[PDB]
From Swiss-Prot, chains A, B:
Pfam families: Phosphorylase (PF00343). The modification N6-(pyridoxal phosphate)lysine is found at K654. Allosteric enzyme that catalyzes the rate-limiting step in glycogen catabolism, the phosphorolytic cleavage of glycogen to produce glucose-1-phosphate, and plays a central role in maintaining cellular and organismal glucose homeostasis. This is Glycogen phosphorylase, muscle form. The modification Phosphotyrosine is found at Y192, Y215, Y446. The record marks Y144 as: Can be labeled by an AMP analog. Its EC number is 2.4.1.1. Homodimer. Homotetramer; to form the enzymatically active phosphorylase A. One of its GO terms (cellular component) is skeletal muscle myofibril. AMP binds at D31, Y64, R292, R293, F294, K295, S296, S297. The gene is PYGM. It comes from Oryctolagus cuniculus (Rabbit).
Length: 811, 811
């Protein structure tokens, strides 16, 4: 049907049909009379997966023969979403499968909807790991993702009476066709025990053993025949475990709980023993696998030439003392050589500056669980602080600030400090974020070792986030500039030549309208909600957090409602305001914010005077597959975090690529997006980081804003008095109290500028030609935000490897 | 190579080779350079399993179109063993696969050894269910086995310092190719709650819900293209289960524990809540599935014409009140009609007379777990006792004896009484056992309803237990009489014509020698033990129980050792005495018996004066795959239970079919075996049931035997003084004490007769021609003991259906 989806040759279509029927019969044990739509999905999944096998075997064979430097990306989160369409895209099978299924009397898009998301992450950090794997395969790097195979991923969100309810994400229930169990590579992981000192060094003894069983998932590059591996570990009890008899068998669950469930906190640290066990489990199993593969190439001098380990935040920070443990205790290297190898091998990426998100593990936990690692950490700290002392003699406060060991009621280990000491490179994830790291939280470390600090601005893969989710846009672009841009996104700059092209303008606007129509229909069908597709689609989707300021959005929504009620017969640009995102289960304020949003909808959506000029919808169960639907449909992207709080953002980049304009603060990657597009093509408002700092110095007084802004006062009085909760008049008192007395994120301080900026958005939307021309200018300058660019920079500046766009031989 | 293993045609071999290579590549993601022997097993398993698919689909399609009466065999145990060879045998693929793998450079027998036993049973009862499924498929019955898919089957037994250690049987670790998950047929099972009475009857409310997910395993008939289904249920928590957040997800294990592990007690009742939950789980899920299938054919009058439910012991006895519950509470039938339907649908098989093996559930357990079922049971009891009262007016003690409710400290429900009341047929499993049921434990019930009581003597499948495990014997038989005997075992009578045939005599003896050589080699390789293959192979393999009298065997072994030591230079027929079997983990005396056996071996096997004239070996981890190896190798089968205690035995039949002679008491099926073969062709000894009864009446005094038999006195003095445990002189005091003061099974009473009978065995073994002629007379009369005969009798006399030997069309 459309060109970028590849060829549908008669030989291919005939073959796909044959193999689909073979799988339905032999694999699924069904015939067409009893087969359910789920059976059809599986038959198609197996048919497509068959095409990966040869390429996967020969990619891995290739790395063995050429022995390149291998990259190991360690993460506790890989937010993969669905795999079927992505695989078809990367193998150029989409049109062929579409035709083959059509001839079998099936709708492929209907089959695609059956697949469960692999929701093995919370939000931005987990999704970044996924985009990164796609880019590493597309750039021909010998890369492996290593993580945990959670039995339960991020919970499914249900909204009941306007409140979030959590439901277990039992994603493996029907079996996962996109994994291959590798029980032959099962490895032991050790916990507890004690340290014994012998004539020849320390020994870690009397440990409990949990087995780590690997499951491999293929990661196909874009049409280059490369298939890399994501290896995820599952926890298994040994067979002699706890071995009255019945209870011993039932108690195997205690060991196996390690890989049971993903912790649902993003940007918040909870010091629970189970989480610590998860972090060590992935690290211990992975490092053994890395060392085994390296030996199959005695002398660890060449280890850093053949191995790079990337730590995705501090979650796998135990890699540093674990590598030391293996090199010193097991391989018998001297400390200084082991340390040199470790530093040159490891690099660390920081993803946040919020103090409550930093991992600070109580010493007593590490003492019981990982006694040898605590000893190694103490030694690392002593030698590091000896270096600080020599560089800054007499500066005793620097010594306390820089220590890996934090003093207080409970002694804690600062894992970020451990990562900096033990890594040759430390990076932030957007220019402003990386600068903040050097000037504030890690200032002391930057002064000691300035060469370690780098920036690597985040990106997204334009395979999933354009070709897959927005084929209509991909196609109209391809018609003008060809297909090369899909793996060289900078080519989108060529679209600047078409900004005055009447045909292109019409086509861009038409694709958006179609996307909005499709999404308005998705809403009615699956959620029985009725929206006006002619309205401006105003979208804020991301995890619910005070710093992300969904609350500021709420205030604007109520302002618009109040203005309409004040002057009902005045024209306003119609809007559909969509907010979605999950709240961490224990985060009370985030749960209240969801309830507020739905409560506002309850009032606004049923007011006869408003009509269809304003609708407020909460998008339930926001996840990767939902993002793929809503992002192409959006007109306005809300990126409104308080300046200095969103490290990068990546949702922002997705909207830019897909033809929405952005309203945002100068925070995270927004800064670089505005710089790429031109500030005149962006809706910037609000305090800069410097303004926030000024306000903090004299002190933030919310009352001042309340006193000076009558429209703001009205809203607060409506919230307090029970206008949005007539049955429970005091329901939102916690929210009002926080805003008035305890607001870390200065919601009121940006209110006036935000509302004014929103007026300017409405003005532009009244002029479809000019709206669309600004859109073209955004899409045309989105090239920098490809994760291909990001990964090429990691490769050259951190890992010491060259990317390659060259094809591997096919069959 | 050998004829009974089928044809190896060039087309077939070429095709098998192609598909084997396809599976290694696409299914296993391996090539020949990295493939392990386990990979090769799986490639072969998938290749063979592909051949089942068409036959399985069309068998089930056939039953849907013809709508025959369906047979549902409910069991908590299905002791299946390995599946690969059995499938090849039944599909006539053995020689073709042997050739195909040979040409690929592989040894198929080596690949077969990789498969794990499906050890979903304890011993005889579980293995009977397995033989039954094979026979039902071979006889073309529309039969389904229903059970539980235990994550852990019977434990693997390790012997450490002569003591049994238990290890978890993690049989699903590598994945099970012989199952297909059917999550689309998942059903809810209810627990706890309370009963509410409305204007229109009772309602069971406020229940907790566990999901039952079915897994289907094919059961192929012997070369008739029939493939029946064994459906096993797995426990799954609902997604909203317990739904701080982390703990709620981890607590899903509590629901899912229902299908985690097989209870390892055979012939012993333990009233644990988890076991009760297992029993209801299988019953509730199965009955829903049965009813659903029946409705897909309003009026339940025809239910018993279309449905038979066979209860394998009392373990699924809750089927009776569950059927009533559904018919009365959900379908709104009147009580009397529901009861008529229930009785006509259900039949019950009893497998033991030991009082400690009978299920007697405490009322307080049923009250909490299954409140509605307890009410139904009370009502069943009231109406039943009203019938007893009318038949036997004034007989108040009969009323107390026959009640389903037992009085005492704790009120209990007698499940066997429930089964008799609610079934149209009750059978024992050998003639003597069925007679004992009528004369003793169920005498009162037999007097009330004599028509309900039947006998169905047990059998074994001659596919697994001859063709599969003993191809050499199967072949020499086939050479004389053709192949028809494999599904018509009575044809073995034709071998009586060959009892004087010198060629046949030589061939029978040669096959035994080869089997013994192969087993003597298996022992050296896997267990580093050295046995003389010229010795008489004296074998007792079965679960360890006092009633089975492994202890009597021990006494004979020590007698032989003592006699040798007394007259070292006298000739004795050399013996290898092999004992094996698992002890239930909580059965202390059975654990001591294992320790005694190994302790005797420790003395006997290292005494230079004995040489190779006597060896005592404990066979570790006795299970189905081990039985397939040892049984063909045996010369003498030990079946030495106290008369009246072994309901049938089935191991006895296996040895008979495979060319061993039997030393045994007139107990269980031994009686019918001796009757078939002729008592002159059997080594019968010891008390009959009548003699045991006489002894009980005057009282059993072990001291009398000790006082009168000097050889027995010596043995007891050796045990007591520490001759067999020099470091722990008192180790066996518990055993001595039991024998002397508390022996329920009268070990001493049969000692003299046993020893004398063993002398007669040795005498015959000195004459190879006459030994072998008696063997031929045993094999020739083993036909009655085919489970094909057993199932044909169930079919005609209980289920009301005709067996069919006719082929279904192939492809
Ligand atoms: O279908 C359910 C089961 O599938 C199994 N996969 C098998 S047998 N082959 N895969 C082959 C294959 C081939 C190409 C790509 C990939 Cl990604 C896999 C998995 O090991 C198991 O964990 C899972 O439960
Ligand atoms: O770099 C990718 C993205 O990373 C996000 N960080 C996230 S989701 N961290 N989760 C941290 C976390 C997660 C679990 C536990 C703990 Cl203790 C911390 C940033 O907020 C976002 O600006 C950026 O675009
Ligand atoms: O290989 C491991 C997995 O295999 C799956 N089987 C699948 S996908 N097809 N089977 C087809 C089939 C075909 C013929 C006979 C039989 Cl018996 C099965 C099982 O559902 C799953 O529980 C198991 O873990
Ligand atoms: O009919 C087949 C065989 O059945 C055997 N019975 C066995 S293994 N019962 N287990 C009963 C059992 C098992 C678990 C729990 C409880 Cl509470 C009882 C008989 O002992 C044997 O003579 C006969 O040949």
């Amino acid at each position: 049907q459309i060109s970028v989806r590849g060829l549908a040759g008669v030989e291919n279509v005939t073959e796909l049909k044959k193999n689909f029927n073979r799988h339905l019969h032999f694999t699924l044990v069904k015939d067409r009379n009893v087969a359910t739509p789920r059976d059809y999905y599986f038959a198609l999944a197996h048919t497509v997966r068959d095409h990966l096998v040869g390429r996967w075997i020969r990619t891995q064979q290739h790395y063995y023969e050429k022995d390149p430097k291998r990259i190991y990306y360690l993460s506790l989160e890989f937010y993969m979403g669905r795999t079927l369409q992505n695989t078809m895209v990367n193998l150029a099978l989409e049109n062929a499968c579409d035709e083959a299924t059509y001839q079998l009397g099936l709708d492929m898009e209907e089959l695609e909807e059956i697949e469960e998301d692999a929701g093995l992450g919370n939000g931005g950090l987990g999704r970044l790991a996924a985009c990164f794997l796609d880019s590493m395969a597309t750039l021909g790097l010998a890369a492996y993702g290593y993580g945990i195979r959670y039995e339960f991923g991020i919970f499914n969100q249900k909204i009941c009476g306007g409140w979030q309810m959590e439901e277990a994400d039992d994603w493996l229930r029907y079996g996962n066709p996109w994994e291959k169990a590798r029980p032959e590579f099962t490895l032991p992981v050790h916990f507890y025990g004690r340290v014994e000192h012998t004539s020849q060094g320390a020994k870690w003894v009397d440990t409990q053993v949990v087995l780590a069983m690997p499951y491999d998932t293929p990661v196909p590059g874009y049409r280059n025949n490369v298939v890399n591996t994501m290896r995820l570990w599952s926890a298994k009890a040994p067979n002699d475990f706890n071995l009255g008899y019945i209870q011993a068998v039932l108690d195997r669950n205690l060991a196996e709980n390690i890989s049971r469930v993903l912790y649902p906190n993003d940007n918040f640290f909870e010091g629970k023993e189970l989480r610590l066990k998860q972090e060590y489990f992935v690290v211990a199993a992975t490092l053994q696998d890395i060392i085994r593969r390296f030996k199959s190439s005695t002398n660890f001098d060449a280890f850093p030439d053949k191995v790079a380990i990337q730590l995705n935040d501090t979650h796998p920070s135990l890699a540093i003392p674990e590598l030391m443990r293996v090199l010193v205790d097991l391989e018998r290297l001297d400390w200084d050589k082991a340390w040199e190898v470790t530093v040159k091998t490891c690099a660390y990426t920081n993803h946040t500056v919020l103090p409550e998100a930093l991992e600070r593990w109580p010493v007593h936990l590490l003492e019981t669980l990982l006694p040898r690692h605590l000893q190694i950490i103490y030694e690392i700290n002593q030698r590091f602080l000896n270096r600080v002392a020599a560089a800054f003699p007499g500066d005793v406060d620097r010594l306390r600030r820089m220590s890996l060991v934090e003093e207080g009621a409970v002694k804690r280990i600062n894992m970020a400090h451990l990562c900096i000491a033990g890594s040759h490179a430390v990076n932030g994830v957007a220019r402003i974020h990386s600068e903040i790291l050097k000037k504030t939280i890690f200032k002391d470390f930057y002064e000691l070792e300035p060469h370690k600090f780098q920036n690597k601005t985040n990106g997204i893969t334009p395979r999933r986030w354009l070709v897959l989710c927005n084929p209509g846009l991909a196609e109209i672009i391809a018609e003008r500039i060809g297909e090369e841009y899909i793996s060289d996104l900078d080519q989108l700059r060529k679209l600047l030549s078409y900004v005055d092209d009447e045909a292109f303008i019409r086509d861009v606007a038409k694709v958006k309208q179609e996307n909005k129509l499709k999404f308005a229909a998705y809403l009615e069908r699956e959620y029985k909600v009725h929206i006006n597709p002619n309205s401006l689609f105003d979208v804020q989707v991301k995890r619910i957090h005070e710093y992300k300021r969904q609350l500021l959005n709420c205030l604007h929504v109520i302002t618009l409602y109040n203005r309409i009620k004040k002057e009902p017969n005045k024209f306003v640009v119609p809007r559909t305001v969509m907010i979605g995102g999950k709240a961490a289960p224990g985060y009370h304020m985030a749960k209240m914010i969801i309830k507020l949003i739905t409560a506002i909808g309850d009032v606004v959506n049923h007011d006869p005077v408003v009509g269809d000029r304003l609708r407020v919808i909460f998008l339930e169960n926001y996840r990767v597959s939902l993002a793929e639907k809503v992002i192409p449909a959006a007109d306005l992207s809300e990126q409104i975090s308080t300046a200095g709080t969103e490290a990068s953002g990546t949702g922002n980049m997705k909207f830019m690529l897909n033809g929405a304009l952005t309203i945002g603060t100068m925070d995270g990657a927004n800064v670089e997006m505005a710089e790429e597009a031109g500030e005149e093509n962006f809706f910037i408002f609000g305090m800069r980081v410097e303004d926030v700092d000024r306000l903090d110095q004299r002190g933030y007084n919310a009352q001042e804003y309340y006193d000076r802004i009558p429209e703001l006062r009205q809203i607060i009085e409506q919230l307090s008095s029970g206008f949005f909760s007539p049955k429970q008049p005091d329901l939102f008192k916690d929210i009002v109290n926080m805003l008035m007395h305890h607001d870390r994120f200065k919601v009121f301080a940006d209110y006036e500028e935000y509302v004014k900026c929103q007026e300017r958005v409405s003005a532009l939307y009244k002029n479809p030609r000019e709206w669309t021309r600004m859109v073209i200018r955004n899409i045309a300058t989105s090239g920098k935000f490809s994760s291909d660019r990001t990964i090429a920079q990691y490769a050259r500046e951190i890992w010491g490897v060259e990317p390659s766009r060259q094809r591997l031989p096919a069959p």
